[PDB]
Amino acid sequence: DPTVFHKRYLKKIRDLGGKVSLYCYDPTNTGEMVAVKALDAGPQHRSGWKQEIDILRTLYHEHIIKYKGCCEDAGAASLQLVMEYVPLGSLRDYLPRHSIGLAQLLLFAQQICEGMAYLHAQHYIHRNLAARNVLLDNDRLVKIGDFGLAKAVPPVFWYAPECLKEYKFYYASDVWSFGVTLYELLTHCDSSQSPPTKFLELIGLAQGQMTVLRLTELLERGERLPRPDKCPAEVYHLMKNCWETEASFRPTFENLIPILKTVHEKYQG
């Protein structure tokens, strides 16, 4: 996509959270809200940035945030990435404020799997799958964002043992993160139940440089996040399956889609 946004029609509304900001884009001096990501940076962060832009340019799917174009970023001697803006924001902000039923959360889970299967079918890994990077376009439509860490296959509290211990990252490693993301959904991203809160409670906060190693030891011993309240046993077993220590015993996102379809159906009625 070679779409170019002219800086002259861009007015900043707010920062969204690399840095992503919300702009109005209005050439008739009433128009479209857009999210714009901008790259301070130096040590080949620039090449990673070119990677992100090129990855997003090629991805087109209902459950992946839509690429809209680029604009000259004279101030960082780069491009800025222009994306669709989603007003409800990320599930991290939305879920604490609302009380979503199980069937709806399962639908979100299914849609995340669809976007991720698509991504994997493109030979890309995401490496940052967490509730905070899942955006809610409408009450029944989820989109995966934040491709900042995404890579062509040649967040430590969301990472599988092979990532933490060996610095490897498989398709199966994104499936582990999906498991943790699904746990977030079922706890409505309550901070007191969050993966950092729960794992720091076991590890403690006085382990010098060894936090990650301690986390790894607990995972390899088979320690896992608890069953959220009113998560069905079968959904908890699905999560535990996304968390197999051995990467090859995890389901793929392709495996997960028909299962999640079926369970959503069951809880919907």
Ligand SMILES: NC(=O)c1cnc2[nH]ccc2c1N[C@@H]1[C@@H]2C[C@@H]3C[C@H]1C[C@@](O)(C3)C2
């Ligand atoms: N298209 C977008 O990026 C985007 C689109 N609509 C949005 N509405 C509110 C935030 C937001 C977006 N924000 C980003 C998203 C969520 C949060 C903050 C931004 C960086 C983050 O990593 C973490 C991914």
